[PDB]
Design a protein around this nucleic acid. Sequence first.
DNA 1: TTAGGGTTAG
Length: 364
Amino acid sequence: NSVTYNTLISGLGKAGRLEEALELFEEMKEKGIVPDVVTYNTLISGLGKAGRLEEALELFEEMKEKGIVPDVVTYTTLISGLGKAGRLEEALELFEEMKEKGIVPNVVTYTTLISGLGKAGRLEEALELFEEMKEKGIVPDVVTYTTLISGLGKAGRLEEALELFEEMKEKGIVPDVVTYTTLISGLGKAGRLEEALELFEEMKEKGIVPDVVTYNTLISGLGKAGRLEEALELFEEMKEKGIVPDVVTYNTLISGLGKAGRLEEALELFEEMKEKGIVPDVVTYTTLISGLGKAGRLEEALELFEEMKEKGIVPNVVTYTTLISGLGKAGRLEEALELFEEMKEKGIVPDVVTYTTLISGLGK
DNA sequence: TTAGGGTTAG
């Protein structure tokens, strides 16, 4: 029964049925049968990817207590989850713990830390870790390079991101659609959309086929350069090439339309995505709430905020800030303050944007 | 057989 139950949970986890996997896991522990490390790693990954990091860390504690020894996969998964949640110090603490326990980190472990460091803007530390990895005889692959290229591009260090891309090719590491898309994004964000479009052409000529993420990146870049009509033309064509738009495609176009004040069309796409089975998320609702509030349609923005909660979508700091900005600009400071208090009550931490927005409203 | 990279909102 131990092997059958473990294969089942590991199977369900692989199939993305986390709650069903968790159920059989509890059921196997009720019947006193011991879960294996693959089962624990699968559940820890699922929980981490669902944002349920405290539950992931609880399972990590549970396997240690039950005498199930964490391996490189266990630590790498948790380091990934902690890093994605901006909990860099804890991710690094876990990396120091695995090393003290004689568990050998590999290229995946190091790439995961490089990613978490780069996302927290600690790019120099990511560059130093990349040098450290090489000194230990760990060979970076296409994923490791792409990770750093992304960190560099996000800090607007495009000349260094392209230098690293050239170094990578010089070492015989072949770029894939992800490497090219990363650069297309970086270029597009640094006001170099034309270079990004030339690189997209050079990518295709090298036999690299774009995926939906490549298209979403081009759509984003076009919109930012005041070329929303070309973004919409690319989307209206995207379907013909067989590429299926996803939640991000819709979120990006909704943002572009909403920023241009073309709110009716943004809402048309919101209805179109729902008809096509594409499920709106926190980004979809927050983008529309911002579009509505900025166009003076504050009551609609507040009603959409109610709708979002009713659909089980959890508002974040971005959602609260856009409404605080909306309420503040309309002179509804009492409501903006209550919302600032409600957000704090839900454990949502304000950032500099939240503070400066609220001060601007109260200061008028 | 579980773990790493690219896209979107204030």
